[PDB]
Design a protein around this nucleic acid. Structure first.
Ligand SMILES: [Mg+2]
Lengths: 134, 114
RNA sequence: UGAGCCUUGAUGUGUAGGAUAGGUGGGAGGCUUUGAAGUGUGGACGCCAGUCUGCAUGGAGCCGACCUUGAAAUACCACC
RNA sequence: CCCC
RNA sequence: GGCACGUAGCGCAGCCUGGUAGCGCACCGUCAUGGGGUGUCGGGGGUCGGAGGUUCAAAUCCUCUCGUGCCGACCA
């Protein structure tokens, strides 16, 4: 159905096996398959019901190494789309960047959260199969 | 296209424009073009201003829109202050072109309320 | 025999307006011979308008940006 | 359908 | 607490399953009659119980509240 590009990338991962943070920056080298500085998107699956006006998010996080002040707001269904940088932005440093991001979200934790705050963090690639970590 | 400063009777014969003007209709258009010396077979988008200013002056002799309704309102004030039967008919807000009103005056007495 | 659930398949005429486009939402290279555009058709849906995919010939070209649109592409990726 |  | 109704004057869909208040009755005025009824024809009549947000838009989403109801709980 596809070429030698997408199938190898999608089989080099595992959707049911939620990788860890340290191993999350281990396969982006093989998941980066564009002839430029391809980005990597991130999704935070949240554990609240944003159907209420009481449960919106809004803020700005400082990238500890730049991409650096990036704004963010949540979603209505509970999936907020954000980003950390590119694939060649020192993958080892991508984990350090992730570290500085989530520490600002746990601090930005609103008080009206009902149920669990966070559910999942999908560190997905822009030209490949993504990854899901706890 | 610019006579009266406000009206733009563009694409209208030298006389059709004057007839379309507010203030005068069929006859004063011809009177104006006769007293000014212009034919009545060409639109206004061809005539220069050296003649349009003259047409403007020639029409500036009669009552104009800005004074047409003023004269009309003056006559209406005369009627309303006299209190005549016509003044009453006008103050009752009824159609105005004639005398008959009972069963056919619906044009400006509007449709039936009930 | 209902329900739940990983996965995939798959979605969603408004009007507008290149256009069956769900919000977001990051984003220009995907696209290609593990065998093009054009066509062969069968199939699924169809507010049947159009999406739509099997083996194909054609056999290696199209496209995101480009453009007016409520919104932008459905280049790819994003969790539902 | 009803009635004169 | 837990759930189910409020739509012209009446009863209702739409519903308290999105984009743009309609259905029948009621009423008014013609037509159909030899005269009527039934009927069509057209017209007034409402803003979605109230309030607040989500929306390019609410009514049809979510919160609270009002009135009325059934179930259930309730040892200053
Ligand atoms: Mg009258």
């Amino acid at each position: 159905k596809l070429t030698k590009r997408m199938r190898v990338i999608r089989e080099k991962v595992d959707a049911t096996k939620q990788y860890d943070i340290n191993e999350a920056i281990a396969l982006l080298k093989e998941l980066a398959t564009a002839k430029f500085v391809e980005s990597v998107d991130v999704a935070v699956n949240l554990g609240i019901d944003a159907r209420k006006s009481d449960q919106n998010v809004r803020g700005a996080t400082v990238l500890p190494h730049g991409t650096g002040q990036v704004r963010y707001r949540n979603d209505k269904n509970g999936i907020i789309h954000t980003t950390i940088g590119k694939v060649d932005f020192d993958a080892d440093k991508l984990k350090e960047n992730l570290e500085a991001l989530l520490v600002a979200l746990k601090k930005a934790k609103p008080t009206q959260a009902k149920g669990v705050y966070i559910k999942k963090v999908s560190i997905s690639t822009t030209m490949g199969a993504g990854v899901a970590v706890d | 296209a610019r006579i009266a400063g406000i009206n733009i009777p563009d694409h209208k014969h030298a006389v059709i424009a004057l007839t379309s003007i507010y203030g005068v209709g069929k006859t004063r258009s011809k009177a104006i073009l006769a007293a000014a010396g212009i034919a009545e077979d060409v639109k206004i988008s061809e005539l220069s201003e050296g003649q349009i200013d003259t047409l403007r002056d020639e029409v500036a002799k009669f009552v104009v829109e800005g004074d047409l309704r003023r004269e009309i309102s003056m006559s209406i004030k005369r009627l309303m202050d006299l209190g005549c039967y016509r003044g009453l008919r006008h103050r009752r807000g009824l159609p105005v072109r004639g005398q008959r009103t009972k069963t056919n005056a619906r044009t400006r007495k509007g449709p039936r309320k009930p």
